[PDB]
Paper text:
Unlike other PLs, Smlt1473 present in the clinically relevant Stenotrophomonas maltophilia strain K279a demonstrates a wide range of pH-dependent substrate specificities toward multiple, diverse polysaccharides: hyaluronic acid (pH 5.0), poly-β-D-glucuronic (celluronic) acid (pH 7.0), poly-β-D-mannuronic acid, and poly-α-L-guluronate (pH 9.0). We have built and refined the structures from residues A22-L330; electron density for other residues outside this range was either weak or absent. The structure is composed of 13 α-helical segments (α-1 to α-13) connected by 14 loops (L-1 to L-14) and two β-strands (β-1 and β-2) (Fig. 2, B and C (i and ii)).
In particular, Smlt1473 has maximum activity for polyGlcA at pH 7.0 as well as the greatest spread in activity with regards to pH (>75% of maximum specific activity retained between pH 5.5 and pH 8.0) and also the largest observed B-factor. However, significant rotameric transitions of important substrate-binding residues such as K42, K162, R163, H221, and R312L have been observed at different pH values. Y38 and Y39 are part of the N-terminal lid loop constituting the R3 surface of the entry site, R218 constituting the roof R2 surface of the entry site, W171 and Y225 forming the iRW surface of the entry site, and R312 forming the F1 and F2 surface of the entry site. At the exit site (Fig. 8D (i)), the pH 7 apo structure has continuation of the high atomic fluctuations in the same left side from the exit site view (i LW and ii LW surface) and includes residues such as K42, Y115, H168, and R215. We found that pH 5.0, 7.0, and 9.0 have, respectively, two (N55, Y222), four (Y38, Q112, N167, H168), and three (R215, R218, H221) residues with the highest atomic fluctuations at the [−1, +1] subsite.
Numbering used by the authors: 22 to 329
The structure:
């Protein structure tokens, strides 16, 4: 039933693929080279996200056990604890943040089924990847753009699934830095600097912010309400951009790639007073993003976890 997990490689070798200062114009060769270099990591991430999707779909214990088995194996292997191997940038470090987000959300989805010895393998592994990730943001030079929000989501998810307050606190701080970056006009200055991908990077900064408030909701906290619902200025800026890129074109130094809004809409439409603004985006799913915990359509409908 449960296939043999792939080996866990202790190192990540990722490749940056933007040619401009604005981090907006893709070199096709470097992108493919990145794709082939991360393919095992992407496959693993997809696989645990999918098996945890199945657990939530119908309660099948065999799905949870297989998800847990896959996570235990990469824990036992010390996967991604090795050197983050730079090539042209910190793409490897970004990859470990996204990989934590995937594996930590996968774990959280199936935690109810985890036996004491599975928790003792998996918990310490998530906790070191989480700390390893944070340590990168201690350097005062690294601007805390959308990547800091992606860092936060897995640090928070790990904090929640492993019951480590240090990492819950550090998650919360990432989220709140994000909410307080949201200008009066719903823009984020560090994302506005991303030329033709400025609108894409607002969608990409909002997603982990929404999933972090969704985790806060698992603890019965409402973080959507931070700063008199400041998050709703970003959501409105993004859902309107996806319909019409004109505001972004007028406020950036390049013509925007048009946006299909990502699966954060599945959650936001259910929280939001007036979800109808999300009808077109919702029609373009289902939304699968292992990075954000797998099947966002399933998790918005049925919850991120089966038993509180």
């Amino acid at each position: 039933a449960c296939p043999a997990p792939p080996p866990g490689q202790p190192d990540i070798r990722a490749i940056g693929y933007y040619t401009d200062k604005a981090g907006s114009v893709i070199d096709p060769a470097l992108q493919q080279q990145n794709k082939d270099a991360t393919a095992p990591l992407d496959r693993y991430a997809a696989d645990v996200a999918r098996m945890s999707d199945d657990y939530l779909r119908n309660g099948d214990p065999a799905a949870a056990q297989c998800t847990l088995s896959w996570l235990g194996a990469w824990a036992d292997d010390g996967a991604m604890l090795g050197q983050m191997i730079r090539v042209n940038n910190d793409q490897s470090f970004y990859m470990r943040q996204w990989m934590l987000d995937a594996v930590a959300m996968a774990y959280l989805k199936v935690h109810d089924q985890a036996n004491p010895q599975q928790r003792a393998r998996i918990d310490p592994w998530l906790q070191k990847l989480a700390r390893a990730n944070l340590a990168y943001w201690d350097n005062p030079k690294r601007r805390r753009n959308n990547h800091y929000y992606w860092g936060g989501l897995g640090v928070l998810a790990t904090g929640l699934a492993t019951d480590d307050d240090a990492l819950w606190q550090a998650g919360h701080a990432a989220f709140q830095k994000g909410i307080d970056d949201i200008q009066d006009d719903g823009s984020l200055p560090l994302e506005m600097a991303r030329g033709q991908r400025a609108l894409h990077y607002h969608d990409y900064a909002l997603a982990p912010l929404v999933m972090m408030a969704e985790l806060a909701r698992l603890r019965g906290q409402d973080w959507y309400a931070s700063r008199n619902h400041a998050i709703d200025r970003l959501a409105r800026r993004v859902i309107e951009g996806s319909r019409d890129p004109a505001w972004f074109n007028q406020h950036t130094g390049a013509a925007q790639l048009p946006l299909q809004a990502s699966g954060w809409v599945e959650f936001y439409r259910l929280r939001s007073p007036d979800g109808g603004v999300f009808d077109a985006a919702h029609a373009r799913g289902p939304f699968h993003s292992p990075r954000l915990g797998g099947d966002l359509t399933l998790m918005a409908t049925h919850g991120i976890v089966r038993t509180p």
